[PDB]
Symmetry: C4
Amino acid sequence: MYLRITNIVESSFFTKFIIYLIVLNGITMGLETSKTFMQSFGVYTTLFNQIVITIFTIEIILRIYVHRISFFKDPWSLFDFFVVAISLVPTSSGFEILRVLRVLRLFRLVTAVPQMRKIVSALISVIPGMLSVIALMTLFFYIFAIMATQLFGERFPEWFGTLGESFYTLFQVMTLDDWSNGIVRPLMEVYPYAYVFFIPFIFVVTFVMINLVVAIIVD
Amino acid sequence: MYLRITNIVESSFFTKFIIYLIVLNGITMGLETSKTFMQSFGVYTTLFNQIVITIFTIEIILRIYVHRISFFKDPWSLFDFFVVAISLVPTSSGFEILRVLRVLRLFRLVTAVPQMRKIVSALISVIPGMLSVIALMTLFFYIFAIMATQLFGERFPEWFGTLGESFYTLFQVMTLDDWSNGIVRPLMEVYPYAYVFFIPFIFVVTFVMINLVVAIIVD
Amino acid sequence: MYLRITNIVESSFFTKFIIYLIVLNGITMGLETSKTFMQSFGVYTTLFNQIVITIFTIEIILRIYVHRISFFKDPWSLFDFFVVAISLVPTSSGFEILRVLRVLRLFRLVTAVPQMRKIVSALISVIPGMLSVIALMTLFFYIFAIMATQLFGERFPEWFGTLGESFYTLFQVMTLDDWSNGIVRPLMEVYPYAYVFFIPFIFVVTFVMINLVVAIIVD
Amino acid sequence: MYLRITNIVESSFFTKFIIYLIVLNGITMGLETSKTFMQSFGVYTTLFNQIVITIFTIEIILRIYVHRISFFKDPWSLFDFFVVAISLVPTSSGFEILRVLRVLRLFRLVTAVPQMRKIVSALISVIPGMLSVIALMTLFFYIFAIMATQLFGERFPEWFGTLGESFYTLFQVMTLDDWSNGIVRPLMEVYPYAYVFFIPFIFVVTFVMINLVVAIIVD
Ligand SMILES: CCOC(=O)C1=C(COCCN)NC(C)=C(C(=O)OC)[C@@H]1c1ccccc1Cl
Ligand SMILES: [Ca+2]
Ligand SMILES: [Ca+2]
C-alpha cells in the first residue's frame, strides 16, 4: 500500500497532473466572476470545482501517508494542507466569507513550482531580522494611536474616534496618502498645532522605513 | 555580385543620414500637436511625412537583401520594421487609432544611437532576472482581484464590478494613489472589515517591490 | 546600605517586574479608549496609573543614588527621568497637553529592553553624517518658503500666507501629496507660470533625497 | 601702492564678514514676510538692505580686479556676479517679478561656506552619469506627450489640450499624484481603453527610475 503509492506520488505525472489542474482551476476561476458566463455555463464550473477539491484532497492524504510526520515539518506542505482544508467546505449557504478565501488555492502553483518557491523563500528570509523593527514600529504606532484617539477623536470621530480608527488613519499617513489636504489640513482647522504631531510622525516613520530597507540591502 | 549596395548603406554618412530624418520628423511631429501650425503648414508636413515613410521603407528593403535571415533576428531592426509598417497601414482603413501609433516611429532614435541602445539593452537585461517576480506579482494580483469582485462588485460596480476593473482598482492601490480616503474608506462605510484585505495587500505588494529592488542592486 | 540597594535595582527580578508593569500600563491605556469601559471602570485605572507612576518614581529615585553622577551622562536613563518627570506635573495644571504627554512613558519599553536599545542606537547612528545634508535643505526650504510667500500668499493665504504657511505647504509638495490637482493647478489659474516655481523645486527636492539615501548606504 | 587689497580679500576676516552679513540679510528678508514688521520697522530694513547691496557690489568689484579672467571661469563667482547684478535693477518701470528674484542672493551662504559648496559639487557630480537616462526619458515623454495631445486633448483640453499641458499632466502621473481617481478614471468615461495607454507608461517610467537609483548606488 505504502509501496504502490510512493511510486505514483513522486512521478513527473502526479505533480504535472496537479499543476496543470491549478492553472485550469485558475482560468475557470476568472470566468466565475462573470455573471454572463454563470447563467449559461456555470453549473459546469461548480462541480468542476468539486472534482478538483477531491483530487487535491486525495493527493494530500497520499503525500501524508508517504511522507508521514515529515509532511508537517514542511512549511510548503503545511500551506498546501491548510489551503486545501478551508477550501473543502461546500458553499452550503451557512455563510459567505469562507467562500471567497477559497481562491487562495491558486497559491498552490507557488508551492509546487520550484522557480517561484525559492523567491518566496528568499523573501521570507528577509523577515526574521526585521521582526525587531516591526515590533518597534508597532509599539511606536501604538503609543501614537493612543495619543491620537485622545487628541483628535472628539472633533474628528471618523478618523481618530477609536483606537482602531486611529491606527488606520496613522497607517494612511505613513503611506503619505492624501495626508495633508486630506487629513492634517482639516485637523488644523480645529487644532492648529496638529502639525507638531504629524510632521514629526512623518520624519520618524519614514526614517525607520528607509533604514529598514538599507539594513535589508546591506544584510 | 551586387556588393555595391551593401557597400552603399553601411556608410557612416548613411547612418547619421537616417538619424537626421528621425530628429527632423520628431520635431515636425511635435509641431503637428499645435493647431495653429498644421493649418498653415499642414501640407508641407503631411508631405514631408509621406516622403520619410517611403525612404524608410526602401531603406528597410535594401537592408534585408544584405543581411537576409539575420535582419529579422535583430531586435533593433525588427522594431525598425514594424514602426515603419504602421505608417504603411492606410489612414482611412478602420479607426484613426493607427494614425496615432505612427508616432511610435520616433523611438527609432533609440534603436539608431548606441548610447540609447546601451541604456535600453541594459534596462531590459534587468527583466529576465525578474521574470520570476513578475509571474509571482501577476499571480498575486490575479488572486486578490477575483476576491474583490466577489466581495465588493455589486455595491461598488465602478471599482470592483469586474475583474478588469478589480485589477485596475488593485493596481491603483499598489501605486498608493488616493487609496484610503478615495477607495478603502468608502468601502468601509458599507463593508466595515475591508481593512483586512487592503492593508495586508499593501504590506505584501510594497514588500515584494522593496526587496526585489535590492536584488537588482546585488546582481 | 549602599551595596544592598545597588544589588536589587541591578537585579534581573526588579527590571522584569518593572517591565511587566510597563507592559500592563500600556495595555490599560489601550483600555481607556472605549469610553463605555472608562465610565464603568476608569476610577480603578486612573489611580492604577498613580501607583504605577509611584513605583516607577521609586525606581528612578534609587537608580540616581546607585549611579550617582554617572546616571545623567546616560542618554537612555535621562530620557526615562524626563519621560516620567513630565507625568508628575498635575493632570489639572498647565493644560491638557501634559495629560497626553504622559503616554510617552511607554517609550520605556524601548529603554528597558536591550534588544530595542539595539535597534534605536543603530538608527540614531545614521544621523550625524546627514546633518550636512539636513543643513543645506533647511536653508533651501527657507529661501523658497520666502519666495513663495511673497508670490502666492496674497491670492492664496492658506497655503503661502506666512512663512510658516509656505513652509507647511512646501513640505506637503515635498511629500509629493496631492501636489498637482490639489495645489499648483489652482495656483496656475491666477499665476499661469507657477510651474516654473514648483517643478524645478521638485526636481531638486527629489534629487537630494535619493542621493541622501545613496549617502546613507555608503556611510 | 600695490594690490594692497589682494591680501585682504583672502583674509579670513573679509569672508567671515560677508557670511555674517548674508545671514543678517537672510534674517532681514525673513522679517520682511511679517506684514506687521514692515509697518513698525519697514524703513529700517530698506536702509539695512541698501548698505548690504552696496557692500556686496563693492566686494564683487574688488574680487574681479584681483582674479581678472579667472573670475569668469569660476561658476561660483559667476553665480555671485549675476546674483548681485539682479538685486540692482530698478524696482519699477516694468516687471516686478524681479523684485522677488533678489532673494536668490541668500544662496550666497552656500557660496561662501566651503561645505555647502562642497556638498553641491558633490551633488552636481552624479548628474552627468545620469544625463544619458535624462535624454531617453525626455525623449519618451516628448513622444508620449505628443500621443496624449492627439488622443485626449479634444474632450479634455485643461489636461492635454496643448503639448505643454500634456507634458505637465504626464509629469504629474509620473509623480503618481492622484492619477486614477484624478485622471484616468474620467478619461475612461469617454475612452474606455485609456488604461492600455497610461498603465504601460506607468510601468515604464517607474521601471526606469528604480534602475536609475540602482546605477547610482553600486558605483
Ligand atoms: C519658519 C517658522 O516655522 C516655525 O517656527 C514652526 C515650527 C518650528 O518647529 C520646527 C519643528 N519641525 N513648527 C513647524 C514644523 C512649523 C511648519 O510650518 O513647518 C512644517 C511652524 C509654523 C510657524 C508659523 C506658522 C505656522 C506654522 Cl505651521
Ligand atoms: Ca496621494
Ligand atoms: Ca490626492
